[PDB]
From Swiss-Prot, chains A, E:
PTM entry text: Glycosylated.
Subcellular location as annotated: Cytoplasmic vesicle, Secretory vesicle membrane; Cytoplasmic vesicle, Secretory vesicle, Synaptic vesicle membrane; Cytoplasmic vesicle, Secretory vesicle, Chromaffin granule membrane; Cytoplasm
Residues the entry annotates as binding Ca(2+) 3: 93, 96-97, 99
Protein name as catalogued: Synaptotagmin-1
Residues annotated to bind Ca(2+) 1: 33, 39, 91-93
Subunit: Homotetramer. Heterodimer; heterodimerizes with SYT2 in presence of calcium. Interacts with SCAMP5. Interacts with STON2. Forms a complex with SV2B, syntaxin 1 and SNAP25. Interacts with SV2A, SV2B and SV2C. Interacts with RIMS1. Interacts with PRRT2. Interacts with DNAJC5 in a phosphorylation-dependent manner. Interacts (via N-terminus) with RAB3A. Interacts with SYT12. Interacts with calmodulin. Interacts with DNM1 (via C-terminal proline-rich domain (PRD)); this interaction facilitates vesicle fission during clathrin-mediated endocytosis (CME).
Positions where Phosphoserine occurs in the chain: 125
Residues of the full protein shown: 141 to 268 of 422
Curated annotation (Swiss-Prot), chains B, D:
Phosphoserine modification, residue list: 32
UniProt domain EF-hand: residue ranges: 18-53
Subunit (UniProt): Homodimer. Part of a copper-dependent multiprotein complex containing S100A13, FGF1 and SYT1. Interacts with FGF1 and SYT1. Interacts with IL1A.
Protein name: Protein S100-A13
Swiss-Prot record, chains C, F:
PANTHER family in alphabetical order: FIBROBLAST GROWTH FACTOR (PTHR11486)
Name of protein: Fibroblast growth factor 1
Lineage: Eukaryota, Metazoa, Chordata, Craniata, Vertebrata
Effect of residue 111 to E: Loss of CSNK2A-, CSNK2B- and LRRC59-binding. Reduced integrin-binding. Defective in integrin-, heparin- and FGFR1-binding, and defective in inducing FGF1 signaling, cell proliferation and cell migration
Effect ascribed to mutating residue 11 to A: No effect on integrin-binding
Alphabetic keyword roster: Acetylation, Angiogenesis, Cytoplasm, Developmental protein, Differentiation, Growth factor, Heparin-binding, Mitogen, Nucleus, Phosphoprotein, Secreted
Locations listed in the record: Secreted; Cytoplasm; Cytoplasm, Cell cortex; Cytoplasm, Cytosol
């Protein structure tokens, strides 16, 4: 399963108790619409916790769009240990059944929020 | 020591052969792609080259000369030609290309 | 000391963390007691995966998707096989007819039945159970 | 002219083309294989895979078939095909067809 | 440039002053003769020193022959530091101009003769 | 301190050891003073490779094969170029017409002129000369 790559820089807030999921952009995304492109938008979801749901701005016909949306991981740093965040990129062809071109996730407990977690996250077409 | 690197030509046939194999074994017989199996290749790892994720039937008929509804290894392999062609060719008539 | 049997696959820190809910993922942690199952050979070659003292019993969804929580349906019966690659293999006899043998996604979860044949290496699990040596 | 960003499988088709490109830019013209570019390629990069470095001329004639003797940007490519099947297909092609 | 691989175990003699180049065999040797096989024989040569020349037994039509020939590196251990040994595998088709399917070499000075130098040497097709 | 200019290419301990004979190889040693050349920009962009205080002057054999000993023929004139990859590039203007720029084989020797294009990375040499900083 492959969804390309997504660059991001995640930082933590100890005042309001939220992690700042600042992604840069996604590169090399699968096509859905007829034309070799899609309307991929990242829908930030969470495990059982489910205490957060944000919809990014639809990116009409683009497999390498940039925007850098601000996702607020509503959950105390102390709680993050038991919360696995999941970033799924949803399409918005606007005709057929919008499919999940791909997604990515990481065990927050293993994400030592020392300062800022910046890295070139790999994207996978996990049909979940 | 072990895990010795071969020639670039052995590398590249392997990488596509393993990918092929990770689709060939989906259903009955881990050599032949059946119809779904075949469509799964294009729809997943081929969104630009052959952006036609609807007329897979046309490709299938163009490929499976005997129309057994099995692209055997060598029959399936045809696609890789049309790929290796397209990357140069793509629409060298109108577009353009790039 | 037959106890918490840890099992995972694919090179890289990732363990099968089972949850009563059913959504088991490859959590790369050993701090919280949720990555242990009671793996044992029930019948001649038939091994079962039941996270008794930690989670729930497994119950594959037609092999295609791997899950567990409600009841340890026959879907959870797998044939214990070993590969000369330092990995364990378990054939879901319940679906062996289709040459399908339990396969999980290290960075996704256990659910690759349509891809549980010879193609995905994730089928070669690496067990770290407390044997009686 | 050439390639900005590609994909995972596009790399591994590039790497072999890059071999092609640094062998065909020899006498004339990098866009066509010439016959002290071709023979040098078989004798160096394909001495084990292609166990017929002394009978290249036959392959050349079979490849070229417009017979302009520019092994063109897909005449040539066929060769990589013949090696690709060869690993599977020891000798067992025959065929004869106008 | 590829010629396959050659396994060898080289030891040193401090009584007669010679290095024992005990090779095991060569694997994946390129073809030369019409068909798919060659008559590769390793011709042990040396740099300027040129104080040694041995011809191995011709191996008729074989790309993975075994024999384990004994090459005596005629040169004092103390001198080895300034002598780069070169092992070239020569073909013996017996018809055309015998070509050098490949060869390999290593800076002896960097070869700390502590006990025995055993390794899986990589073979390259030296067009020389 | 313009002195012994060490130059080599391809990741891995290997230095260009020049010998009066001419057969220069990529010796991975720094004990014997035979891996230093007097690299300098003779003309505007034209750099020369002469192992004065250690070996001999270079004289490429039609670019195809790199050698040196007898005389520093024009073949030894190269254009100094730099690549954004922490490596130095030298274009053998003498054969630039054919798009050929000096290339050596870390585990073979300097002689890859018919393959000196955008394929063999060995063209990107890594210099370790004693500059005047």
């Amino acid at each position: 399963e492959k969804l390309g790559k997504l660059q991001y820089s995640l930082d933590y807030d100890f005042q309001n108790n939220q992690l700042l999921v600042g992604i840069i952009q996604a590169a090399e995304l699968p096509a859905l619409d007829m034309g070799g492109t899609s309307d991929p938008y990242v829908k930030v979801f969470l495990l059982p916790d489910k205490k957060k749901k944000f919809e990014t701005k639809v990116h009409r016909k683009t497999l390498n769009p940039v925007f850098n949306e601000q996702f607020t991981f509503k959950v105390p740093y102390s709680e993050l240990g038991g919360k696995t965040l999941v970033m799924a990129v949803y399409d918005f062809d606007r005709f057929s059944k919008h499919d999940i071109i791909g997604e990515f996730k990481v065990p927050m407990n293993t994400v030592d929020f020392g300062h800022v977690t910046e890295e070139w996250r790999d994207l996978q077409s996990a049909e979940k | 020591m072990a895990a010795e690197p071969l020639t670039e030509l052995e590398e590249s046939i392997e990488t596509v052969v393993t990918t092929f194999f990770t689709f060939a074994r989906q259903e009955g017989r881990k050599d032949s792609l059946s119809v779904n199996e075949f469509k799964e290749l294009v729809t997943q790892q081929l969104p630009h080259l052959l952006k036609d994720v609807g007329s897979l039937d046309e490709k299938m008929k163009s490929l499976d000369v005997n129309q057994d509804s099995e692209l055997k290894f060598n029959e399936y392999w045809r696609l890789i030609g049309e790929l290796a062609k397209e990357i140069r060719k793509k629409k060298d008539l109108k577009i353009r290309x790039x | 000391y037959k106890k918490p049997k840890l099992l995972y696959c694919s090179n890289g820190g990732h363990f099968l963390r089972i949850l009563p809910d059913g959504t088991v993922d490859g959590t790369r942690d050993r701090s919280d007691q949720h990555i242990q199952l009671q793996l044992s050979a029930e019948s001649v070659g038939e091994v079962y995966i039941k996270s008794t003292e930690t989670g729930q019993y497994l119950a594959m969804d037609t092999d295609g998707l791997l899950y567990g929580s409600q009841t340890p349906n026959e879907e959870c019966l797998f044939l214990e096989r070993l590969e000369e690659n330092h990995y364990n293999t378990y054939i879901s006899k319940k679906h062996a007819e289709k040459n399908w043998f339990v396969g999980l996604k290290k960075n996704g979860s256990c659910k690759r039945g349509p891809r549980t044949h010879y193609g995905q290496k994730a089928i070669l699990f690496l067990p770290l159970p407390v044997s009686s040596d």
